[PDB]
């Protein structure tokens, strides 16, 4: 062959994952510097670096099934996941379908239970390799630099054994959807416990509590007046409340809170939506009134209207023990009340405005911050994952067919464009917690007492912003040095333009940085947490919330049966999905905010930076801070009426890759 073909004959993947992991180490060594700081070699350098990573790091508004979002047209080489959470992901993944075969009927599951058997002993196997090469490097530090290539193979392993899963996965699939009261719902479990939340679902206070401490703790709202769409009367807020209290006296005193969906939009169908899969789905807009008893204890749930329009659809009030003939009509309206939150918390609060914005903040760093750029350095962790576990949400969880289009009643096209264009309207310092808090005018804790992720996310806010403030302050001597940073400003053009980021605008001092950094830093480590956590123990039990309902809301408070209530919980198949997405995406936890060293071997620092890593230093301080905050929320949850562990640093990743 030609002479020019030698370099192309021997040139394989594997390879290049060695290389691209060595010279991660090698380039670490270099000192982090601002541009201007930079002498002309390295000024040559990064520039000449920069100009490659655009070839590699490339923006697209047209990826498939999530169109008009900007994302990476591919995953580089270097940004697959590492071996560790390859194995940790294979690991639940494997489980759950060792899990869900062993349900089938046994003639279906025949070749599916020796296929996973030989999956499982090949992950136990990678598993020993993985444990084997650790002790080796432990035993010889020395060999730790030679022994990453075999991790490296290692990595192409578990890649091939994932290959396998998914091609597994595709034919249990489609063979479930051709098998498939509220014992269903516990059955599509098989050997996994329910969540604690079947014990609780059915009560009131415990419906209330979500709106605080649950996967969608930002739509709450406090009201001062009731909207005019909602026209609840005095009477109707007497019988629940208590004939010495008013809704004008309630909403003078701050105890008056608000739940309208009115922003799903397209998610919420007006009507009916048939599918082949599926059967009929409905979801909705519903709005929701929440109010504090006098003593501020916790909130109760008041009214709920099933849509906006209140000529169409009746007033809902929480009804008294001894009214039978108002139970079910009352669980009805509850259970819209949860439909519209799936749809809410999934496709705005989880997908919109943690994955798909992480997704715009690293494609920008990577093209426009030098990796010896110090925020670079600092902001490359918190996006550890994020374009690969994005690129598996688009191909595997958006296409026709696939879990969303299951387990959400709108028609996938619009739950697409609905996803996206939320995505596209977040507000970049709007949506910063501080801001969100006082917009809903929930920040004050003598008004709303309990209000878990609000106070434990403070917490974490106010420890990431210290952060930032310290380690801009070792590199940013003024106003002068933020605004003569060239990358930066290239970085602000890049996050407003190409990423499309709603709100951001140029960087013209320190504080402002330092705020910036803190949104972009907890929006990629404690706000993904807080609400991508509560999948599991939240979310999976189908009777306590799902995405679709097989019935429309209920068209009277009176005369509705258990029947009736029963009609609206979704097919087998939704439930199936469900438990195993949520299961999934809750139970792996990789990397933690804080640590600040390679989640893979060799587990080195990503600090070079003296002073930053210093004893007593600004690393060191945001570490015993977030010990002091896991200490302070511990110290809450035993004061609280369940725990609320979602921003426990000791369980918050440092970047969104699950
Ligand atoms: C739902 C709302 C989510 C909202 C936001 C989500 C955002 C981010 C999450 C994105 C997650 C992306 C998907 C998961 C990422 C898992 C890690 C991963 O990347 O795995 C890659 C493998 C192989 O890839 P490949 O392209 O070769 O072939 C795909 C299938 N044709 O994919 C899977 O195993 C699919 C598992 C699907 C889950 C099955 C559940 C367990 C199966 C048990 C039996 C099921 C019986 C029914
Ligand atoms: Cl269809
Ligand atoms: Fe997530
Ligand atoms: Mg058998």
């Known amino acids: 062959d030609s002479i020019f073909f030698s370099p192309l004959k021997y040139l394989g993947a594997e390879q290049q994952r060695s290389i691209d992991a060595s010279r991660s180490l090698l380039d670490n060594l270099i000192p982090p510097s601002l541009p201007q700081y930079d002498n002309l070699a390295g000024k040559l350098a990064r520039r000449a670096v920069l100009t490659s990573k655009k070839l590699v790091y490339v923006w697209t508004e047209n990826f498939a099934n999530v169109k ?3 994302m990476a047209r591919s995953v580089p080489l270097g940004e697959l996941p ?5 194995l940790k992901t ?3 993944i494997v489980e759950l379908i060792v899990n869900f075969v062993a349900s089938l009927p046994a003639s279906a599951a025949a070749q599916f239970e020796r296929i996973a058997a030989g999956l499982s002993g090949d992950l136990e196997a990678a598993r020993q390799v993985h ?6 490097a432990k035993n010889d530090p020395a060999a730790a630099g030679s022994l990453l290539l075999r991790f490296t193979e290692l990595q192409t392993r578990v890649i091939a054994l994932l290959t396998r899963v998914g091609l597994l996965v595709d034919d249990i699939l489609k063979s479930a959807s051709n098998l498939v009261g509220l014992n269903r719902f516990r059955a599509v479990f098989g050997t996994l416990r329910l969540p604690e939340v079947a014990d609780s679902f059915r009560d009131d206070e415990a419906f209330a509590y979500w709106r605080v401490a649950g996967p969608n703790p930002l739509l709450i709202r406090r009201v001062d007046a009731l909207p005019a769409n909602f026209p609840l009367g005095e009477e109707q807020f007497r019988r629940v409340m208590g004939a010495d209290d008013s809704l004008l006296e309630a909403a003078a005193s ?3 809170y608000l739940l309208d969906y009115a922003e799903l939009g397209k998610l919420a169908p007006s009507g009916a939506v048939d599918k082949l899969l599926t059967g009929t789905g409905f979801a909705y807009a519903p709005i929701a009134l929440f109010a504090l008893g006098k003593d501020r204890a916790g909130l109760l749930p008041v009214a709920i209207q099933c849509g906006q329009d209140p000529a169409t659809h009746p007033m809902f009030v929480r009804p008294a023990e001894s009214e039978s003939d108002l139970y079910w009509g009352w669980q009805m309206a509850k259970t819209v009340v949860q439909v519209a939150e799936e749809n809410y918390h999934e496709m705005f609060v989880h997908l919109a405005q943690t994955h798909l914005v992480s997704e715009a903040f690293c494609l920008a760093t990577q093209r426009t911050l030098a990796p010896s750029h110090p925020l670079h350095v600092l902001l490359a962790p918190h996006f550890e994952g994020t374009l690969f576990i994005n690129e598996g949400a688009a191909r595997i969880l958006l296409p026709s067919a696939g879990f969303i289009d299951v387990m959400f009643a709108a028609p ?12 596209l309207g977040f507000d970049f310092y709007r949506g910063m917690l501080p801001e969100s808090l006082k917009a809903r005018n929930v920040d004050d804790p003598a008004a709303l007492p309990d209000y878990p992720y609000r106070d434990d996310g403070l917490l974490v806010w106010n420890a990431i912003r210290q952060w930032a403030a310290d380690y801009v302050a070792v590199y940013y001597a003024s106003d002068g ?7 930066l400003a290239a970085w602000v053009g890049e996050v407003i333009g190409s990423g499309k980021v709603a709100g951001f605008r140029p960087i013209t001092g320190r504080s402002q940085l330092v705020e910036v950094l803190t949104m972009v830093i907890f929006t990629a480590s404690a706000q993904h947490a807080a609400v991508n ?13 799902c995405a679709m309902s097989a019935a429309p809301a209920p068209d009277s408070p009176s005369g509705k049966s258990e029947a009736d209530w029963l009609k609206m919980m979704p097919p087998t198949l939704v439930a199936l999905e469900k438990v195993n997405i949520y299961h999934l995406l809750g139970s792996v936890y990789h990397g933690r905010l804080g640590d600040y060293r390679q989640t893979g071997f060799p587990y080195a620092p990503v600090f070079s930076d003296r002073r930053v890593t210093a004893s007593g230093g600004p690393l060191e301080r945001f570490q015993a801070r977030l010990k002091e905050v896991e200490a302070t929320i511990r110290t809450r949850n035993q004061a609280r009426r369940k725990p609320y562990e979602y921003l426990l640093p000791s369980r918050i990743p440092a970047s969104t890759n699950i």
Not at 82 to 86: A, G, I, Q, Y
Not at 533 to 545: E, G, K, L, N, R
């Open 481 to 487: 040095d933020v605004t003569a940073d060239v990358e």
């Open 68 to 70: 008009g979002v900007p």
């Open 82 to 86: 590492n071996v560790d959470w390859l």
């Open 131 to 136: 444990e084997a090469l650790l002790e080796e």
């Open 254 to 256: 701050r105890r008056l």
């Open 412 to 423: 996938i096209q619009d739950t697409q464009a609905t996803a996206g264009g939320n995505r």
């Open 90 to 92: 294979a690991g639940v």
């Open 533 to 545: 956590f509560p999948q599991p123990s939240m979310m999976t039990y189908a009777p306590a919330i």
